[PDB]
Amino acid sequence: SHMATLKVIGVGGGGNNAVNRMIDHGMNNVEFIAINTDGQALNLSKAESKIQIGEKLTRGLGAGANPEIGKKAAEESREQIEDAIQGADMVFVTSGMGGGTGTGAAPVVAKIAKEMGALTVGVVTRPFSFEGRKRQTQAAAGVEAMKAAVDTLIVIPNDRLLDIVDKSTPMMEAFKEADNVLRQGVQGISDLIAVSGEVNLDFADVKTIMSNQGSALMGIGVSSGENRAVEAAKKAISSPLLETSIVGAQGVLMNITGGESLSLFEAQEAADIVQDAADEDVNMIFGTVINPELQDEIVVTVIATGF
């Protein structure tokens, strides 16, 4: 029997903010690593494993928007990064693009993870338009470098946060909504790995859907009542925060979890929703889990690739 090790690695300020908020919210069986040039921020990290990179280059400060310094910092700490990753079967690298440490170091961290044998997923933000064109261009180069280094990449443009707030929503509450993309994806995969299903999916199926694929979508939806399966499936695939929507997906892993009432008909309905929304002939990997503790709730987990 296989026991997959999942790790989440925050790189730079926004990545380490996401790690801190995920640890606060509560996650289990997931190991966290914080990587930064900024020593003061690392002192505030809740991560069990902390790597300060680039101290000779930055004297414990951030990289000051210089991605070449963030890249050199990570490269010069390769052995320390390898040691922290060793043993991971899957690594999620999260970082905010546009600055120096995230833009420059995150693609190096991802390359090291993949070289170490981990299935490597990047979840990164693009800067708000109000941060200006140069930051957006620098972030775009980081995204391209990430894409070349990971198995799959999920990009969250921060401008989409402006579509989900009202005029008073606290900035921190908006940031938590972006964190949910990563957190719910990690949780969904962790649950798929650990919980035996009646139509069982495991980590090998995650590897098949994700390995060397490029852009990806990861989503969870939960609903109850009439039309629950369709409603949960639509929620799983319809996040307003994503650069890569479901449209165009050629491969999908879909798991449905429900109670003993889970019907064959509604499983087909959920699968058809995903395929219809992809508007492609999708190569599906389908799973089902019966959790009797659940009563009327249904949970649909989707990972889509092949764009």
Ligand X SMILES: Nc1nc2c(ncn2[C@@H]2O[C@H](COP(=O)(O)OP(=O)(O)CP(=O)(O)O)[C@@H](O)[C@H]2O)c(=O)[nH]1
Q: Does 125 bind ligand X (CB under 6 A)?
A: yes
Please indicate if the annotation marks 15 as binding a ligand.
Answer: yes
Please indicate if the annotation marks 251 as binding a ligand.
Answer: no
Part in contact with ligand X (CB under 6 A); list of ranges 58-66, 189-197, 251-259, 269-277: 58-66
| Binds ligand X by CB under 6 A, chosen from 20, 37, 187, 239 | 37
- Nearest distance from C-beta of residue 147 to ligand X, angstroms: 17
Part in contact with ligand X (CB under 6 A); list of ranges 12-20, 212-220, 234-242, 270-278: 12-20
Which residue's CB is nearer to ligand X, number 100 or number 258? 100
Q: Tell me the CB-side half-sphere exposure of residue 181, using CA atoms within 13 A.
A: 33
Q: Does 128 bind ligand X (CB under 6 A)?
A: yes
Q: Does 142 bind ligand X (CB under 6 A)?
A: no
For residues 175 and 171, give the distance between their C-alpha atoms in angstroms, rounded to a whole number: 6
- Inter-CA distances, 84 with 101, 109, 303, Å: 18, 11, 27
**Contact 117/84 with Cβ under 8 angstroms?**
no
Query: How many contiguous H segments (helices) and E segments (strands) does the chain have?
Result: 11, 11
- Nearest distance from C-beta of residue 65 to ligand X, angstroms: 4
Residue 98 touches which of Mn ion, ligand X, none (Cβ within 5-8 Å per kind): ligand X
Please indicate if the annotation marks 16 as binding a ligand.
Answer: yes
Task: For the beta carbon of residue 239, count every other beta carbon within 10 angstroms.
Answer: 23
- Inter-CA distances, 247 with 68, 222, 275, Å: 35, 21, 9
**Contact 127/103 with Cβ under 8 angstroms?**
no
Task: For the beta carbon of residue 276, count every other beta carbon within 10 angstroms.
Answer: 12
| Binds ligand X by CB under 6 A, chosen from 51, 53, 63, 299 | 63
Q: Which of residues 145-174 bind ligand X (CB under 6 A)?
A: 158
Q: Which of residues 194-253 bind ligand X (CB under 6 A)?
A: none
For residues 3 and 242, give the distance between their C-alpha atoms in angstroms, rounded to a whole number: 30
| Binds ligand X by CB under 6 A, chosen from 25, 64, 165, 296 | 64
Taking each helix axis from N to C end, the angle separating 203-210 and 171-194, rounded to the nearest 10 degrees, works out to: 120
Could you give the dihedral angle defined by the CA atoms of residues 38, 43, 45 and 50, in that order, rounded to the nearest 10 degrees? 80
Please indicate if the annotation marks 131 as binding a ligand.
Answer: yes
Question: Length of the chain, please?
Answer: 307
Quick note: the x/- pattern for Mn ion over 24-63, rule CB under 5 A, is: --------------------------------------x-
For residues 109 and 64, give the distance between their C-alpha atoms in angstroms, rounded to a whole number: 19
Q: Does 138 bind ligand X (CB under 6 A)?
A: no
Quick note: the x/- pattern for ligand X over 92-111, rule CB under 6 A, is: ----x-xxxxx---------
Task: For the beta carbon of residue 223, count every other beta carbon within 10 angstroms.
Answer: 20
- Feature table: binding site for GTP: 13-17, 100-102, 131, 135, 179
Which residues lie near Mn ion (CB under 5 A)? 62
Residue ranges that bind ligand X, judged by CB under 6 A: 12-14, 17, 37, 62-65, 70, 96, 98-102, 125, 127-128, 131, 135, 158, 175, 178
